[PDB]
Amino acid sequence: PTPVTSDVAYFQTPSNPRGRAACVVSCDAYSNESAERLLYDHSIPDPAY
Amino acid sequence: RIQYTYFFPVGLHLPVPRYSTSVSVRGVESPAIQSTETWVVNKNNVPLC
Amino acid sequence: RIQYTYFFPVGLHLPVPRYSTSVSVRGVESPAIQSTETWVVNKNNVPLC
Amino acid sequence: PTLAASHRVMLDEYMSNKQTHAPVHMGQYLIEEVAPMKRLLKLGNKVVY
Amino acid sequence: PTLAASHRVMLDEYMSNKQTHAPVHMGQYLIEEVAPMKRLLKLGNKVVY
């Protein structure tokens, strides 16, 4: 389930079904807190947008 | 065998300054209409809702 | 590594005898509406406002 | 992403002309599939690859 | 300059026909880019080089 105001422009490009990108390959190796902060925290705008 | 994942919406809104580009569609363009399903095309090219 | 500059405007106002050329767009022809953002395509072809 | 069309009508526009198709109409939208496999879409006898 | 469409339609119309798009509509505009490098602009499956 998804709000009625989520953008359609997210849906033409390949991405995650959650609203945040989850590519952890880019992050620093063996750093679990830096990888979690990419997934979850909202002080940081998306690595996509 | 190779597995892919297929991402797919249904049931959204579009924001207030509604626009068009199509030259040839005569119907749906009323603002009170709402779409409650989306159509997919199968392996055997049978469109389903 | 060659480094190019780029520039684009946002939030202008076109003068009084408003003209047109296109035959497709039907939604945004109002004189009351004014755009407050511009859409720039990313490196990976993803349009951002 | 795959084929999605919030009305049956806008799935006809994608198979009549693929270039001058409009991705977003006033109430409804369409998502063209961006997948590593590109299938033959054949509905009726008009074929859009 | 870059692609700077004031509304979503102008960038959805530059894709559909590169020649016969309107650079300045009634309220909104578009800047076709003049850059020393050229790129492929895949917004979906339609390509404008």
CB A22 within 8 A of CB A38: yes
Task: Locate the chain E residue with the closest alpha carbon to D22.
Answer: E12
CB D22 within 8 A of CB C26: no
The maximal CA–CA distance of chain D, rounded, in angstroms, is: 30
Neighbours of chain E (3+ CB pairs under 8 A): A, B, C, D
A7 and chain E in contact, CB less than 8 A: no
E21 and chain C in contact, CB less than 8 A: yes
Spell out the residues 6+ positions from residue A31 whose beta carbon is closer than 8 angstroms to its own.
none
Task: Locate the chain D residue with the closest alpha carbon to B38.
Answer: D6
Q: Which amino acid is at B45?
A: N
- Cα(C34)–Cα(C20) distance, rounded to whole angstroms? 16
DSSP E strands, E1-49: 41-43, 46-48
Task: Tell me the three-class secondary structure of D3-48, residue by residue.
Answer: CEECCCCHHHHHHHCCCCCCCECCCCEEECCCCCCCCCEEECCEEE
- Cα(E12)–Cα(E2) distance, rounded to whole angstroms? 15
Helix (H) or strand (E) holding E42: strand E41-43
* Residue corresponding to tokens 């020649």: E19
Strand partners, E47: E42
* Residue corresponding to tokens 């050229």: E38
- Cα(D22)–Cα(D14) distance, rounded to whole angstroms? 8
- Cα(B13)–Cα(A49) distance, rounded to whole angstroms? 21
CA B3 to chain centre: 25
User: What DSSP character marks residue C47?
Assistant: E
CA distance C3 to chain E (A): 11
